[PDB]
Enzyme design. Structure first.
Site, PDB file in Angstrom:
ATOM      1  CG  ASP A   1      -5.447   4.076   7.452  1.00  0.00           C
ATOM      2  OD1 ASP A   1      -5.513   4.105   8.768  1.00  0.00           O
ATOM      3  OD2 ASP A   1      -4.322   4.286   6.955  1.00  0.00           O
TER       4      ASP A   1
ATOM      5  CG  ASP B   1      -0.227   0.095   2.495  1.00  0.00           C
ATOM      6  OD1 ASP B   1      -0.072   0.827   3.218  1.00  0.00           O
ATOM      7  OD2 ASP B   1      -0.174  -1.152   3.130  1.00  0.00           O
TER       8      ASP B   1
ATOM      9  CD  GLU C   1      -3.823   3.902  11.432  1.00  0.00           C
ATOM     10  OE1 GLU C   1      -3.596   4.364  10.119  1.00  0.00           O
ATOM     11  OE2 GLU C   1      -2.953   3.988  12.339  1.00  0.00           O
TER      12      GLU C   1
END
Ligand code: CL
Length: 209
Positions: free
Chosen positions: A96, A7, A98
């Site tokens: 994503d 990624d 986090e």
């Protein structure tokens, strides 16, 4: 077995996708958006490069749950690279979700607020595309910011970051296992290293649904 992927984001100005593919990479997740207005400006160049090289590819959204509802951010992601179709080329979009890079733990949200925010994002994503998005997180973050919440495991593929020679031993929430393991933040061909859990045939099923 596993399938290698990776990624990337605007932190990689240039990626040699042909070289990654020669070296066994079969898929790549590419940062598309962040929050409500930020468009990753290298996304287009990366996504085209990945397509021409014959990789499976999809976009990802960096969540900022303090800035808007989950649905708002889903819609923004969807208009700017986070789309999906069953075209033999496309991974479902990845959320994503986090650590807050901006210095407030869990973005100032409670467990119930954060669980609601993530539900709002993933439901919008599914409404728009017919696919549950992948959820990228760490076990530590999921525990701290959601109270290790269940309810996403049977729908959203888990992309689990845990940097080690060994696969992750702590699986968050009610997930059975990870779909993708982000095993290092130092991949030779750029960005982070990722491993899909299974053979290519199962990876193509993740792409097609
Ligand atoms: Cl955080």
């Amino acid at each position: 077995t596993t399938v290698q992927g990776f990624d990337i984001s605007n932190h990689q100005k240039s990626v040699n996708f042909e070289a990654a593919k020669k070296d066994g990479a079969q898929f790549v997740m590419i940062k598309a958006t962040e929050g409500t207005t930020y468009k990753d400006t290298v996304f287009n160049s990366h996504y085209t490069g990945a397509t021409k090289a014959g990789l499976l590819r999809g976009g990802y959204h960096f969540a900022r749950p303090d800035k808007s509802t989950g649905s708002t951010q889903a819609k923004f992601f969807l208009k700017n690279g986070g789309g999906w179709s069953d075209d033999n080329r496309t991974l479902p979009g990845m959320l994503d979700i986090e650590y807050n890079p901006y210095g407030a733990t869990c973005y100032g949200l409670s467990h119930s607020q954060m669980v609601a925010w993530i539900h709002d994002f993933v439901n919008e994503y599914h409404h728009a595309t017919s696919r549950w998005p992948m959820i990228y997180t760490t076990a530590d973050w999921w525990n701290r910011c959601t109270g290790n919440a269940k309810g996403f495991g049977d729908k959203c593929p888990l992309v689990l970051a845990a940097y080690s020679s060994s696969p992750p031993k702590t699986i968050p929430g009610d997930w059975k296992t990870w779909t993708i393991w982000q095993n290092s933040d130092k991949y030779k061909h750029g960005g982070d290293s990722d491993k899909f859990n299974g053979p290519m045939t199962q990876l193509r099923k993740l792409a097609s649904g």
